[PDB]
Amino acid sequence: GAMTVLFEGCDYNHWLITMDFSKEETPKSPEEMVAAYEETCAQGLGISVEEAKQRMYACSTTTYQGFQAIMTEQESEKFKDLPGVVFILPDSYIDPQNKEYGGDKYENGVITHRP
Amino acid sequence: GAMTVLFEGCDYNHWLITMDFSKEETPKSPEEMVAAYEETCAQGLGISVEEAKQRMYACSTTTYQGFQAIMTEQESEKFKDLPGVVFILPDSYIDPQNKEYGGDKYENGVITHRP
Amino acid sequence: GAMTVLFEGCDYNHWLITMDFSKEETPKSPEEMVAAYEETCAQGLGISVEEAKQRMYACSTTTYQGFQAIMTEQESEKFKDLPGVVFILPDSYIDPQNKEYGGDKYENGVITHR
Amino acid sequence: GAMTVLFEGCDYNHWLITMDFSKEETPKSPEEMVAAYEETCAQGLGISVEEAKQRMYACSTTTYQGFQAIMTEQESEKFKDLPGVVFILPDSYIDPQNKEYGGDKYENGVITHRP
Ligand SMILES: [Br-]
Ligand SMILES: [Br-]
Ligand SMILES: [Br-]
Ligand SMILES: [Br-]
Ligand SMILES: [Br-]
Ligand SMILES: [Br-]
Ligand SMILES: [Br-]
Ligand SMILES: [Br-]
Ligand SMILES: [Br-]
Ligand SMILES: [Br-]
Ligand SMILES: [Br-]
Ligand SMILES: [Br-]
Ligand SMILES: [Br-]
Ligand SMILES: [Br-]
Ligand SMILES: [Br-]
Ligand SMILES: [Br-]
Ligand SMILES: [Br-]
Ligand SMILES: [Br-]
Ligand SMILES: [Br-]
Ligand SMILES: [Br-]
Ligand SMILES: [Br-]
Ligand SMILES: [Br-]
Ligand SMILES: [Br-]
Ligand SMILES: [Br-]
Ligand SMILES: [Br-]
Ligand SMILES: [Br-]
């Protein structure tokens, strides 16, 4: 009805996607891992790599192997069928007061390591 | 992937549906309110009234005007287009210690007042 | 640790609180019910009635009996021990194209019926 | 109030905790990683290592470096202050028809590898 209040639950719009590179005979360099994150992001979202880079905001190849991107929960589910994907999880701040996510910063292909 | 761990969040299967009888031209007796809950439950789920009576587990005509029933989250969304429906919300315990929902208990049309 | 990412769930910042006046012998007028929402909101949030009126954004005495205000999940929990409170729930739009919650609009003490 | 129904979101009692081993100078064997998981689980839960080994049900040192244990959400929060902990997240099935979590199975110290 016009006065219906439907509860739809949590709205998670920042997601962490980790990847499994342990299989390979030859280990990927950090650059190769980040290039893989970008391709996987584009594939799961159904968008160009250029558009996917705009969604991505952080990644790591050290503390963890994965990337973090803005996407809806409905979007995150599409990653479940891609090869190499391990965790698909809402991202959470490592530093609430500054609203900072963990990992290295990612800006359209530019990584800033965060100590 | 074969190792993918997808977070899907909360899945609720106990739902509260409240009703608006303020726009009715004739005031409903308590029994007539319960009859309307049964009809609304049947219409939203696409099942018969006798089948809906099995899903319902509680209701009120005093503290609030609504009923509570077992249904999937997908089924709860079907109530959004029904006339007279106000809140569609996961039900929660009134007494968490005893895992008891609020309102009067409803068992296939037999209702028990609960303090 | 310095790298620890703890998952805690989502928060909600808009809450609907309904109230039970069915127990009342002498029925409250709509104006009296709204006065009770303002007092309850202030009591639950631990703030002045003046501040509570700034946080409330909608209410009803017809479609339902309740009020809606900006507060966190931690804040909403504090209403559980006040008299007359029935449901405490995250509020949701009734009209997403206008980003409107349900009930009448409440603007710092003034109600516009919707 | 006596009639108060406070919305309760869903609870999780299966948690996955991942760990970062890089500060340590000597790279660990898989058994040294599992020993660290047992010790971290005990410290986080505030229980003996013997009890912690009973609470764990899976772990990995390959696909990811982490362990999985039964605990409440309030318990999982205590892991946030432990050294080496990276992600603390609700665990989810990798094979939902069989209700199997990921990682290698862990039964009070006995690991069954699950590639
Ligand atoms: Br990881
Ligand atoms: Br979504
Ligand atoms: Br989508
Ligand atoms: Br960030
Ligand atoms: Br740019
Ligand atoms: Br930075
Ligand atoms: Br795979
Ligand atoms: Br959740
Ligand atoms: Br009526
Ligand atoms: Br049926
Ligand atoms: Br109500
Ligand atoms: Br069900
Ligand atoms: Br309607
Ligand atoms: Br019950
Ligand atoms: Br009973
Ligand atoms: Br949680
Ligand atoms: Br005042
Ligand atoms: Br305030
Ligand atoms: Br009361
Ligand atoms: Br809004
Ligand atoms: Br509004
Ligand atoms: Br208006
Ligand atoms: Br929720
Ligand atoms: Br769980
Ligand atoms: Br032991
Ligand atoms: Br398992």
Tokens found for residue A113: 């390591």
Cα–Cα distance for residue pair A29/C57, rounded to 1 Å: 53
**Backbone phi, psi, residue B36, to 5°:** -70, -40
Instruction: Report CA(B85)–ligand 13 centroid distance (Å).
Output: 7
Cα–Cα distance for residue pair C54/A34, rounded to 1 Å: 47
Instruction: Report CA(D15)–ligand 24 centroid distance (Å).
Output: 7
Indicate whether A19 belongs to any domain.
no
Indicate whether B4 belongs to any domain.
no
Cα separation values, B52 from B33, B47, B71, B77, Å: 15, 7, 10, 16
Which amino acid would we find at residue A18? T
Indicate whether C90 belongs to any domain.
yes
- Smallest CA–CA distance, residue B21 to chain C, in Å, is 8
Closest CB from A2, A5, A92 relative to C7: A92
CATH code of residue B88: 3.30.70
Q: DSSP secondary structure string, B6-54?
A: E-------EEEEEE--TT-SSPPPHHHHHHHHHHHHHHHHTS-HHHHHH
Please report which ligand is nearest the Cα atom of D14: 24
The one-character DSSP state at B75 is H
Indicate whether D2 belongs to any domain.
no
Q: How many domains are contained in chain A? A: 1
Resolution, expressed in angstroms to one decimal: 1.5
Q: Under the phi-then-psi rule, with left for phi > 0, alpha for psi from -120 to 50, and beta for the rest, what region is D28?
A: beta
Contacts of D46 (CB under 8 A, 6+ apart): D78
- Smallest CA–CA distance, residue A107 to chain D, in Å, is 23
Closest CA to A42 of A15, A65, A69: A69
Indicate whether C95 belongs to any domain.
yes
User: What range defines the domain where residue B26 resides?
Assistant: 14-112
Indicate whether D9 belongs to any domain.
no
